Amino acid sequence: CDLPQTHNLRNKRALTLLVKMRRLSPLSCLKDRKDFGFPQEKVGAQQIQEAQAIPVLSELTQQVLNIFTSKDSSAAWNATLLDSFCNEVHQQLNDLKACVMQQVGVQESPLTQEDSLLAVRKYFHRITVYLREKKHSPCAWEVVRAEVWRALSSSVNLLARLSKEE
Amino acid sequence: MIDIENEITEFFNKMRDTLPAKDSKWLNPSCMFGGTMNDMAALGEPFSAKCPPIEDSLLSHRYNDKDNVVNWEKIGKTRRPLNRRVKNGDLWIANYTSNDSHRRYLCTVTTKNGDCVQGIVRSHIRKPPSCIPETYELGTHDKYGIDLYCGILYAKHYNNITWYKNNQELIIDGTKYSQSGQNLIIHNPELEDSGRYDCYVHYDDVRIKNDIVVSRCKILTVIPSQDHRFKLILDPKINVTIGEPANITCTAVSTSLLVDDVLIDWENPSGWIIGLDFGVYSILTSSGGITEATLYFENVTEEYIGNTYTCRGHNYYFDKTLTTTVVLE
Ligand SMILES: [Cl-]
Ligand SMILES: [Zn+2]
């Protein structure tokens, strides 16, 4: 992608705000754990190139933003941290979307993109269903925050890996 | 590729089938269902929303024609058309009220081919923050400059954005400052660029004489270049007993005691990041210059012995790992 400036430190700011956002000990929520089927297989650099990664990461960033800007989110988390977290994430999403624009009809491997985009969407759909069935309980929100932390951390590590392989 | 497009269609069909009856009853069965969305809004500020299928990353390439018509209807109690409440094909509310947070909308996209897709849009109130603090460390990307974002806006289709520093209007002439959309770029950054930056976003609606104005604030602190070194601390092994739990903690210590300056995670023998999973899980705690990741084994079985776990600390300045081996005590 041709961006004026990449802002990697936004990723560090976002992830550490998310870590800081935690309110409960997950040791209090062990029974609320759930395997969401994070699609590692379809977000790994051993095959995925940056051309496929961009739009998939734009989607993950949008889904993350959708969860933390929701009606129920502002009651669940500290507003100061939450507002800062969404500020960082929204800007990264702006940047990712701009890249997605640049590659409209010139999509490389549209198949693996769409297959990845769908696996990501299903994953977050399972997360949101989980949270609704749990009535947005404090433990369910922790399980979700932790999972999102893991999804973002995997994306950041992937981006780091891809920038090394060049 | 045909399998994938089929799975996508099925995905949105399932989502349609899982809607409440109070939602699905408004849908035209001749139309594809294109999803739902619940957007943020602030009382006393303008609000706008796109029709979900248009914005959806899975369906965008399906309804991407310049000659599409988009209709907006209020649903819920009655079913009413929208005239004043549309701007540039988007739902538009010039002054959001408590009553709006209870209203929801059906948008319909009609293509020239005579096909259609629908979405449902809700909104919820969200106090917009006051000032958000931002820190720029000199030496990050000084030649590009500092990008200040005019805050999260709940409505698009603004005509003008104006920036103030410490309540003084900034002269935007491409020297010290330039603008790009909702961004203010501060060139040749220096410590004195620290301050209060307010942006004023101007909206025009014919049904209103003066301007609708939305305001956001960032408190910018520019700091000197920092030493971002850190050290990782992790016992080389974890002594376990078959049929018992165990835990081990990896600690990152910031050399300059910088707060929240290290990203930490645990990874299993296969390279994957460990979360709140079954069998092995991870919990992070951060305070001052110390970040800890604790790894938990719920119930050690013989298969675990000799497994190697990797603790990774990184912060874009440095990237370090340490491993630990599961050993039978
Ligand atoms: Cl940055
Ligand atoms: Zn930056």
Domain ranges in chain B? 1-126, 127-226, 227-329
Contacting B residues, span 8-47, partner chain A, CB-CB under 8 Å: 8, 11, 15, 38, 40
Is 2.60.40.10 the CATH classification of the domain at B227-329? yes
SS3 B66: coil
Contact A111 B1 (CB under 8 A): yes
Distance CA B141, CA B223 (A): 13
Annotated binding site of B for Zn(2+): 141
How many Å separate Cα B167 from the centre of its chain? 29
Nearest CA-CA distance, residue A84 and chain B, Å: 7
* DSSP assignment of A12-74: HHHHHHHHHH--S-GGG-GGG-------STTS-TTT--HHHHHHHHHHHHHHHHHHHTSTTHH
Is 2.60.40.10 the CATH classification of the domain at B1-126? yes
In order of A161, B95, B173, the CA distances from B155 in angstroms are: 37, 10, 27
Distance CA A42, CA A27 (A): 30
Contact A19 B260 (CB under 8 A): yes
Q: Tally Cβ neighbours within 10 Å of residue B62.
A: 18
Fold identical between B1-126 and B127-226?
yes
Q: Strand order of the sheet with strand B308-314?
A: B237-240, B319-328, B308-314, B263-267
Contact B149 A7 (CB under 8 A): no
Residues facing residue B213 across a β-bridge: B202
Distance CA B54, CA B130 (A): 31
SS3 B252: strand
Q: Determine the residue type at A74.
A: S
Give me the domains of chain A, ranges plus CATH numbers.
1-166 (1.20.1250.10)
Distance CA B169, CA B162 (A): 8
In order of A32, A157, B17, the CA distances from A151 in angstroms are: 18, 10, 28
Distance CA B300, CA B246 (A): 8
Q: Tally Cβ neighbours within 10 Å of residue B46.
A: 24
State the CATH class of domain B127-226. mainly beta
Technique of determination: X-ray
